[PDB]
DNA sequence: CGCCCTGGAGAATCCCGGTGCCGAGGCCGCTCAATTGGTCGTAGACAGCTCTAGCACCGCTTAAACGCACGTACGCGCTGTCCCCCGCGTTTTAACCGCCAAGGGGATTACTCCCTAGTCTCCAGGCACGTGTCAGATATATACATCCTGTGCA
C-alpha cells in the first residue's frame, strides 16, 4: 500500500518551511 | 447492510552534541573636522497699540428626522455536481567546474585653470488697492381684464 497525504496537507507544512527562511525564492541568473 | 472509535504503523520534528570555518572586533597607524576662543552685527522676544471677526444670544421659519406600518426579495442555508489542481513518479535542462589565459574601459584620485554669480549698490515701475460703471436681479405703476351688481327691459 503507498503512502500518499490527501490534497492540502503539503501546502501547511511548505507555510512552515518557506515561512522560517529568509532566502531568496528567485534564481540570480533569470533576474 | 455500512459509519465513529480504536489501534497499529510510518515519518516528520525537536533537541542535543560534535567538529570545521570565517568575519567581529580588537589593535595599531594615522589624521582631520570638532573644540575653544574672539569678533560682529542681527533677528527674536517684549511690549505697544489697535482693530476686528469670533462669541454668546434671541426669535421667526420652515425642513429634515423620526416613528411606524407594510412588504417582498435577496442574503443565507442547504444540497447535488463535476472538474481542476495537488501529490508523486518519471524526463529533461541550467548551471557549476576543468582547460587554458589574456586584457579593458570607466569610475577614482589628483591637479589645473576661469568665469558666473553672491554681494553691494541705485534707479525705476507695477500690481494691490480704490473707484466708475454696467449686468442682473428686484420691486412696483398700469392698461386692460374677469366676476359682481344695479338695472332697465318684453
Known amino acids: ?3 500518499r497525504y490527501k490534497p492540502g496537507t503539503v501546502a501547511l507544512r511548505e507555510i512552515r ?11 540570480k541568473l533569470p533576474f
Open 1 to 3: 500500500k503507498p503512502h
Open 17 to 27: 518551511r518557506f515561512q522560517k527562511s529568509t532566502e531568496l525564492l528567485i534564481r
